[PDB]
Amino acid sequence: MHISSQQHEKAIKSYFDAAQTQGVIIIKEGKNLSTYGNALARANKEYVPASTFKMLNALIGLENHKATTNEIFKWDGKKRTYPMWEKDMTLGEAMALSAVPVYQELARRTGLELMQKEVKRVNFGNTNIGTQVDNFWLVGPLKITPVQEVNFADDLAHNRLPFKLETQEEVKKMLLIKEVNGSKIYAKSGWGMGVTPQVGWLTGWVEQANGKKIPFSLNLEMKEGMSGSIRNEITYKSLENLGII
Ligand SMILES: *[B@@]1([O])O[C]C2=C1[C]=C([N]C(=O)OC([C])([C])[C])[C]=[C]2
């Protein structure tokens, strides 16, 4: 392709600049990590994983028979932050809606002791979950870097995490968020509502027509009144600019 790296870099930086935030998107092609965006130093800084942790919470719960993929987690009938969460759902539906209460139930079934063992076994982020099994991914102490998130996505895309192949395939099926021509984007969003500043994530991979998998992790600051879809919009524009989709 004829486009200079200077032009790619400028373009992707401009997507973050135009959203009036600061962020980075890391793309991995084979073993090579490339960092783009308007705040490149964010790449090895630690942030809460927020709802990106649902990927690992689901792997842990399924591997340890705390749930099945068809099990319906019933709404308890209490008011929730979003009306869309006031319904009964499977893990997959809860992944797509980022329904925190379903994943809090799953975490409680797993329990603190097992959760800390599994998070250590996977070597996710700083690996510390502290003492509160139902919010450790939302308010600390668990933290992870964008480089660590893209490497996690790389591991899951290639079935390299230390879970059964079937467990990994089950969770991957929950993560399909877009199809663009013959490309599929598998990813999970994150929004750290309970930290300041608030972190936004979109971490996953592109599966191209030919079967090549290109992992990515977008990380930015979510500003007052910003819409969640900005994470998706910047990610898709960046991937399209690079010709990945
Ligand atoms: B997740 O990042 O995706 C959407 C979302 C997610 C987490 C939360 N809740 C949350 O952070 O709860 C506290 C810690 C603010 C109480 C809401 C929506």
Side-chain angles (χ1 to χ4, degrees), residues 1-78 80-119 121-165 167-172 174-211 213-223 225-245:
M1 177 68 104
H2 65 287
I3 291 167
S4 68
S5 63
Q6 176 188 251
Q7 183 178 318
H8 287 303
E9 289 168 27
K10 179 180 169 189
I12 295 165
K13 175 179 174 288
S14 78
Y15 309 144
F16 293 87
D17 291 332
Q20 296 182 244
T21 193
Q22 313 97 236
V24 65
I25 182 167
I26 309 195
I27 289 144
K28 195 183 191 172
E29 286 167 304
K31 294 165 179 286
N32 191 34
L33 293 156
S34 297
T35 302
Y36 299 95
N38 76 350
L40 302 194
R42 298 173 72 87
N44 297 103
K45 296 190 184 296
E46 284 189 329
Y47 303 93
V48 296
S51 296
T52 65
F53 187 72
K54 294 185 168 60
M55 291 185 289
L56 183 50
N57 197 349
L59 291 167
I60 291 169
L62 290 169
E63 182 87 359
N64 291 286
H65 306 109
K66 305 303 179 184
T68 65
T69 59
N70 63 331
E71 178 174 356
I72 293 166
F73 288 73
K74 294 282 162 77
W75 175 46
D76 64 1
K78 300 187 192 209
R80 301 195 169 163
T81 320
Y82 307 89
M84 49 154 185
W85 295 351
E86 296 172 348
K87 71 175 176 141
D88 310 328
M89 63 199 116
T90 61
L91 291 182
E93 293 163 338
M95 190 75 74
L97 296 173
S98 205
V100 175
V102 169
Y103 279 90
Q104 292 177 309
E105 168 62 8
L106 190 60
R108 294 173 183 124
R109 296 182 184 188
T110 293
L112 188 72
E113 193 191 337
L114 181 57
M115 186 69 85
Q116 184 57 103
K117 288 186 197 311
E118 292 291 86
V119 166
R121 196 170 64 74
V122 172
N123 185 24
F124 186 87
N126 70 1
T127 83
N128 187 18
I129 78 172
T131 63
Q132 307 294 309
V133 77
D134 67 349
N135 74 356
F136 63 83
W137 66 91
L138 301 169
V139 297
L142 181 64
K143 298 230 185 106
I144 190 163
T145 71
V147 166
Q148 286 169 334
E149 285 245 341
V150 72
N151 288 333
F152 174 81
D154 189 32
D155 284 345
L156 178 57
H158 295 98
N159 299 315
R160 300 193 221 110
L161 299 171
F163 294 106
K164 292 178 202 185
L165 171 63
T167 305
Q168 297 182 81
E169 292 295 342
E170 287 176 328
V171 173
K172 290 199 264 178
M174 306 176 186
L175 294 174
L176 180 59
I177 59 166
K178 200 175 179 74
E179 295 191 48
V180 183
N181 303 324
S183 293
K184 289 174 171 183
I185 303 169
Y186 293 88
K188 182 61 189 86
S189 66
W191 191 338
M193 303 290 197
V195 296
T196 310
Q198 298 187 340
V199 64
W201 287 104
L202 186 62
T203 293
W205 66 95
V206 177
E207 184 181 336
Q208 291 179 326
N210 43 286
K213 294 154 190 188
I214 298 89
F216 63 85
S217 183
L218 172 133
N219 176 274
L220 52 65
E221 184 174 307
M222 296 294 294
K223 307 293 195 166
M226 190 162 276
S227 174
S229 64
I230 198 64
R231 294 167 299 184
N232 303 73
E233 288 161 17
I234 294 168
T235 298
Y236 308 150
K237 288 167 88 163
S238 297
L239 297 169
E240 182 186 42
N241 180 269
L242 292 168
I244 295 165
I245 68 186

